[PDB]
Motif scaffolding. Structure first.
Motif, PDB file in Angstrom:
ATOM      1  N   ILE A  75      36.893  52.316  30.226  1.00 57.56           N
ATOM      2  CA  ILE A  75      36.535  53.530  30.949  1.00 57.56           C
ATOM      3  C   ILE A  75      36.768  53.337  32.435  1.00 57.56           C
ATOM      4  CG2 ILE A  75      34.651  55.086  31.533  1.00 57.56           C
ATOM      5  CD1 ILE A  75      33.401  54.294  28.783  1.00 57.56           C
ATOM      6  N   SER A  76      36.345  52.192  32.976  1.00 54.03           N
ATOM      7  CA  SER A  76      36.395  51.993  34.419  1.00 54.03           C
ATOM      8  C   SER A  76      37.840  51.992  34.915  1.00 54.03           C
ATOM      9  CB  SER A  76      35.638  50.703  34.798  1.00 54.03           C
ATOM     10  OG  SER A  76      36.369  49.522  34.556  1.00 54.03           O
ATOM     11  N   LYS A  77      38.767  51.452  34.118  1.00 54.58           N
ATOM     12  CA  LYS A  77      40.163  51.414  34.549  1.00 54.58           C
ATOM     13  C   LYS A  77      40.802  52.793  34.507  1.00 54.58           C
ATOM     14  N   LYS A  78      40.357  53.648  33.590  1.00 58.91           N
ATOM     15  CA  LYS A  78      40.871  55.011  33.469  1.00 58.91           C
ATOM     16  C   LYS A  78      40.268  55.947  34.517  1.00 58.91           C
ATOM     17  N   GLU A  79      38.987  55.753  34.879  1.00 57.65           N
ATOM     18  CA  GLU A  79      38.215  56.767  35.586  1.00 57.65           C
ATOM     19  C   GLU A  79      37.729  56.398  36.985  1.00 57.65           C
ATOM     20  OE1 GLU A  79      38.171  59.654  34.391  1.00 57.65           O
ATOM     21  OE2 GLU A  79      38.703  59.271  32.290  1.00 57.65           O
ATOM     22  N   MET A  80      37.859  55.150  37.433  1.00 61.13           N
ATOM     23  CA  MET A  80      37.335  54.696  38.709  1.00 61.13           C
ATOM     24  C   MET A  80      38.416  53.995  39.501  1.00 61.13           C
ATOM     25  SD  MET A  80      33.875  52.968  37.378  1.00 61.13           S
ATOM     26  CE  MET A  80      32.320  53.813  37.327  1.00 61.13           C
ATOM     27  N   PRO A  81      38.396  54.102  40.825  1.00 62.55           N
ATOM     28  CA  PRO A  81      39.347  53.341  41.619  1.00 62.55           C
ATOM     29  C   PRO A  81      39.011  51.866  41.571  1.00 62.55           C
ATOM     30  CG  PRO A  81      37.838  54.475  43.053  1.00 62.55           C
ATOM     31  CD  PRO A  81      37.509  54.922  41.663  1.00 62.55           C
ATOM     32  N   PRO A  82      39.977  50.998  41.882  1.00 56.78           N
ATOM     33  CA  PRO A  82      39.732  49.559  41.744  1.00 56.78           C
ATOM     34  C   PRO A  82      38.671  49.016  42.666  1.00 56.78           C
ATOM     35  CG  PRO A  82      42.074  50.010  42.067  1.00 56.78           C
ATOM     36  CD  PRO A  82      41.360  51.289  42.288  1.00 56.78           C
ATOM     37  N   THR A  83      38.316  49.723  43.741  1.00 57.92           N
ATOM     38  CA  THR A  83      37.273  49.255  44.644  1.00 57.92           C
ATOM     39  C   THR A  83      35.885  49.763  44.273  1.00 57.92           C
ATOM     40  OG1 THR A  83      37.906  51.077  46.075  1.00 57.92           O
ATOM     41  CG2 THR A  83      38.688  48.838  46.705  1.00 57.92           C
ATOM     42  N   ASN A  84      35.769  50.575  43.236  1.00 61.22           N
ATOM     43  CA  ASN A  84      34.476  51.150  42.918  1.00 61.22           C
ATOM     44  C   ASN A  84      33.475  50.016  42.674  1.00 61.22           C
ATOM     45  OD1 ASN A  84      32.458  51.915  40.696  1.00 61.22           O
ATOM     46  ND2 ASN A  84      33.136  53.911  41.478  1.00 61.22           N
ATOM     47  N   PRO A  85      32.323  49.985  43.351  1.00 63.66           N
ATOM     48  CA  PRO A  85      31.430  48.823  43.191  1.00 63.66           C
ATOM     49  C   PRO A  85      30.941  48.600  41.770  1.00 63.66           C
ATOM     50  CG  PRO A  85      30.900  49.987  45.205  1.00 63.66           C
ATOM     51  CD  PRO A  85      31.915  50.822  44.505  1.00 63.66           C
ATOM     52  N   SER A 136      41.886  34.829  35.283  1.00 62.52           N
ATOM     53  CA  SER A 136      42.837  35.937  35.336  1.00 62.52           C
ATOM     54  C   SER A 136      42.138  37.237  35.695  1.00 62.52           C
ATOM     55  CB  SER A 136      43.555  36.088  34.005  1.00 62.52           C
ATOM     56  OG  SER A 136      44.601  37.039  34.139  1.00 62.52           O
ATOM     57  N   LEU A 137      41.014  37.518  35.034  1.00 62.31           N
ATOM     58  CA  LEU A 137      40.330  38.776  35.294  1.00 62.31           C
ATOM     59  C   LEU A 137      39.831  38.830  36.730  1.00 62.31           C
ATOM     60  CD1 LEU A 137      39.116  41.491  34.550  1.00 62.31           C
ATOM     61  CD2 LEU A 137      37.211  40.299  33.476  1.00 62.31           C
ATOM     62  N   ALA A 138      39.246  37.736  37.220  1.00 61.95           N
ATOM     63  CA  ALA A 138      38.734  37.741  38.585  1.00 61.95           C
ATOM     64  C   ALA A 138      39.863  37.926  39.584  1.00 61.95           C
ATOM     65  CB  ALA A 138      37.979  36.446  38.890  1.00 61.95           C
ATOM     66  N   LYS A 139      40.983  37.247  39.367  1.00 58.44           N
ATOM     67  CA  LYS A 139      42.112  37.348  40.294  1.00 58.44           C
ATOM     68  C   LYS A 139      42.701  38.750  40.318  1.00 58.44           C
ATOM     69  CE  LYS A 139      44.054  32.647  40.130  1.00 58.44           C
ATOM     70  NZ  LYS A 139      45.103  31.836  39.452  1.00 58.44           N
ATOM     71  N   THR A 140      43.005  39.292  39.145  1.00 57.50           N
ATOM     72  CA  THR A 140      43.579  40.629  39.073  1.00 57.50           C
ATOM     73  C   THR A 140      42.633  41.659  39.678  1.00 57.50           C
ATOM     74  OG1 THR A 140      45.024  40.142  37.216  1.00 57.50           O
ATOM     75  CG2 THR A 140      44.256  42.437  37.435  1.00 57.50           C
ATOM     76  N   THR A 141      41.341  41.560  39.364  1.00 59.39           N
ATOM     77  CA  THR A 141      40.368  42.495  39.925  1.00 59.39           C
ATOM     78  C   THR A 141      40.379  42.429  41.440  1.00 59.39           C
ATOM     79  OG1 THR A 141      38.975  42.260  37.972  1.00 59.39           O
ATOM     80  CG2 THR A 141      37.928  43.139  39.956  1.00 59.39           C
ATOM     81  N   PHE A 142      40.360  41.213  41.984  1.00 65.66           N
ATOM     82  CA  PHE A 142      40.330  41.021  43.430  1.00 65.66           C
ATOM     83  C   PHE A 142      41.579  41.605  44.077  1.00 65.66           C
ATOM     84  CE2 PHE A 142      41.041  38.933  47.393  1.00 65.66           C
ATOM     85  CZ  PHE A 142      39.793  38.755  47.949  1.00 65.66           C
ATOM     86  N   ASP A 143      42.746  41.296  43.519  1.00 68.32           N
ATOM     87  CA  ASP A 143      44.005  41.746  44.108  1.00 68.32           C
ATOM     88  C   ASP A 143      44.138  43.268  44.055  1.00 68.32           C
ATOM     89  OD1 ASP A 143      44.652  39.164  44.812  1.00 68.32           O
ATOM     90  OD2 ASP A 143      45.946  38.772  43.099  1.00 68.32           O
ATOM     91  N   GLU A 144      43.765  43.906  42.944  1.00 74.32           N
ATOM     92  CA  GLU A 144      43.888  45.358  42.856  1.00 74.32           C
ATOM     93  C   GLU A 144      42.883  46.039  43.772  1.00 74.32           C
ATOM     94  OE1 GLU A 144      43.861  46.363  38.641  1.00 74.32           O
ATOM     95  OE2 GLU A 144      45.516  44.970  38.266  1.00 74.32           O
ATOM     96  N   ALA A 145      41.727  45.426  43.985  1.00 77.93           N
ATOM     97  CA  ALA A 145      40.784  45.997  44.941  1.00 77.93           C
ATOM     98  C   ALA A 145      41.302  45.871  46.367  1.00 77.93           C
ATOM     99  CB  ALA A 145      39.417  45.328  44.795  1.00 77.93           C
ATOM    100  N   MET A 146      41.836  44.705  46.724  1.00 79.18           N
ATOM    101  CA  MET A 146      42.434  44.509  48.043  1.00 79.18           C
ATOM    102  C   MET A 146      43.364  45.653  48.404  1.00 79.18           C
ATOM    103  SD  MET A 146      41.577  41.848  49.792  1.00 79.18           S
ATOM    104  CE  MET A 146      42.911  41.948  50.968  1.00 79.18           C
ATOM    105  N   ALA A 147      44.246  46.031  47.474  1.00 77.86           N
ATOM    106  CA  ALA A 147      45.262  47.034  47.767  1.00 77.86           C
ATOM    107  C   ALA A 147      44.690  48.431  47.919  1.00 77.86           C
ATOM    108  CB  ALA A 147      46.324  47.031  46.669  1.00 77.86           C
ATOM    109  N   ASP A 148      43.452  48.663  47.461  1.00 76.59           N
ATOM    110  CA  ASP A 148      42.809  49.970  47.540  1.00 76.59           C
ATOM    111  C   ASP A 148      41.792  50.062  48.679  1.00 76.59           C
ATOM    112  OD1 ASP A 148      40.348  51.809  45.725  1.00 76.59           O
ATOM    113  OD2 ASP A 148      42.334  52.661  46.223  1.00 76.59           O
ATOM    114  N   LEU A 149      41.521  48.960  49.384  1.00 71.93           N
ATOM    115  CA  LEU A 149      40.593  49.000  50.510  1.00 71.93           C
ATOM    116  C   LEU A 149      41.027  49.996  51.583  1.00 71.93           C
ATOM    117  CD1 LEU A 149      39.780  45.220  50.979  1.00 71.93           C
ATOM    118  CD2 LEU A 149      38.278  46.924  50.034  1.00 71.93           C
ATOM    119  N   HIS A 150      42.338  50.229  51.728  1.00 70.60           N
ATOM    120  CA  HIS A 150      42.835  51.115  52.787  1.00 70.60           C
ATOM    121  C   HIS A 150      42.290  52.531  52.649  1.00 70.60           C
ATOM    122  CE1 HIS A 150      45.957  52.295  49.754  1.00 70.60           C
ATOM    123  NE2 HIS A 150      46.084  53.394  50.474  1.00 70.60           N
TER     124      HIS A 150
END
Ligand SMILES: COc1ccc(C(=O)NCCN)c2cc(C(=N)N)sc12
Ligand SMILES: COc1ccc(C(=O)NCCN)c2cc(C(=N)N)sc12
Ligand SMILES: [Cl-]
Ligand SMILES: [Cl-]
Ligand SMILES: [Mg+2]
Ligand SMILES: [Mg+2]
Lengths: 12, 229, 229, 12
Positions: C155-165, C190-204
């Motif tokens: 659900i979270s990947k479909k409905e929330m941005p990657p930075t959503n707390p 893997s999960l921690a890295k991918t989560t971190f990287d996709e959030a980084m790109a959405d901080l803007h």
């Protein structure tokens, strides 16, 4: 409240 | 409630509960040990005291938070209701401890180190009751605390050296009683000063380990005197 | 037990209990609020979570202390008995929370922020059950945690941005599940890295305040990755 | 035990 020192565990 | 567990098992589990920072469990185990009816050793008395001091300490801290919110609000009924709830549970813990001391720890305590310890505890838990009491009830509770502390003081001065840690902790707590319960700050200061000075003069008799035990509590007297003068 | 108190009074008292660090009271007040049958707001969901996280956290810490003493002893029955006592109380708290989620918080949660929140909680409390479980029971509990976390992730990947707390905290906890419950450290990393990287790109896309909220949880992912690599 | 970071109160 300022609590003064009393004996034993400072549990509060 | 602990009638089916061995005394030694209750003491063992009190020590485990302490290690796990489960102080409500620790207090229940030690209440069970007391209710076996035998006198308590020095270690066991300290387990009893540590357990209930931790329980009542959390309640006192919570009561103060809620009382402060309540006073500000009085500058719905929920703050008062919840402060009352915590207050009643705090009074219940104090009544339980006082009940153990009256049935029958104090009356069987003949050595100074046990009798002073328990009479100090009696003063302490009446003092905690006094912190949340009002009116005439408060005056009688304050008198009960004073009477217990005074009997403990009289014994300790006759039977213990001035550096004895039990005697020192009693004097510390009785001085705080004077300062903020009895509204006798001068008595508080006098007692703390005299206690500190008489202990200083007796440090020469102590081993390295006993010196550390006594000077630790002396520093608490000094801490208070620094805040009070 | 809280059937006679107003919903709004229960929420008010939960907030007071939080201020007083009375987390068992806080959890009971929030359980009462849930059992009124209405959905919970965002603030109320967080009060529910904070309350039970604090309660179960104390139990987990105590269980670990006792389990460690027990293992050393196995290198009387009292250590095992008392570890079992704490374990049973911990399982009871987890069962209570899971019961609230099943009756009927999850089934009425349709928005992503509520549904993901509750499914994450379901994964978390099955995870805490897994920490103390053994054998086949443990395998089924682990599967239940995994299934809840996975539905929440989908659900979270479909409905929330990657930075959503909420999404970030879910990924954090699911990665810890992988690392030390599922014995899948590579999946955790893997999960921690991918989560971190996709959030980084959405901080803007974020405001100053939202940026602080998201980067706080991102730092927890980094903390774990530093320990794991 | 070394506990890794998880969400919310570090209550254990
Ligand atoms: C000064 O008070 C104590 C004296 C002695 C002990 C003790 O263990 N053993 C010595 C037997 N006489 C003790 C243990 C405490 C605790 N578990 N917090 S306090 C406390
Ligand atoms: C991120 O989680 C929260 C969000 C919001 C609130 C809140 O108060 N008000 C905003 C209404 N939506 C809150 C309060 C918590 C607490 N008392 N520990 S957590 C928490
Ligand atoms: Cl209440
Ligand atoms: Cl037990
Ligand atoms: Mg003067
Ligand atoms: Mg690899």
């Amino acid at each position: 409240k300022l609590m003064f020192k009393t004996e034993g565990p400072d549990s509060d | 409630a602990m009638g089916s567990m061995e005394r030694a098992s209750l003491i063992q589990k009190a020590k485990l509960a302490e290690q796990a920072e489960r102080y409500e469990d620790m207090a229940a185990f030690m209440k069970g040990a007391v209710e076996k009816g035998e006198e308590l050793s020095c270690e066991e008395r300290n387990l009893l005291s540590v357990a209930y001091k931790n329980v009542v300490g959390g309640q006192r801290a919570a009561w103060r938070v809620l009382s402060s919110i309540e006073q500000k609000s009085n500058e719905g009924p929920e703050v008062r209701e919840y402060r009352e709830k915590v207050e009643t549970e705090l009074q219940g813990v104090c009544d339980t401890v006082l009940g153990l001391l009256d049935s029958h720890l104090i009356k069987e305590a003949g050595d100074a180190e046990s009798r002073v310890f328990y009479l100090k505890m009696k003063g302490d838990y009446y003092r905690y009751l006094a912190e949340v009491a009002t009116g005439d009830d408060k005056k009688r509770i304050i008198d009960s605390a004073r009477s217990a502390y005074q009997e403990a003081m009289d014994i300790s001065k006759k039977e213990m050296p001035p550096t004895n840690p039990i005697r020192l902790g009693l004097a510390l707590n009785f001085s705080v009683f004077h300062y903020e319960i009895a509204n006798s700050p001068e008595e508080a200061i006098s007692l703390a000063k005299t206690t500190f000075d008489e202990a200083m003069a007796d440090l020469h008799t102590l081993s390295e380990d006993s010196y550390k035990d006594s000077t630790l509590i002396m520093q608490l007297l000094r801490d208070n005197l620094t805040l009070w003068t």
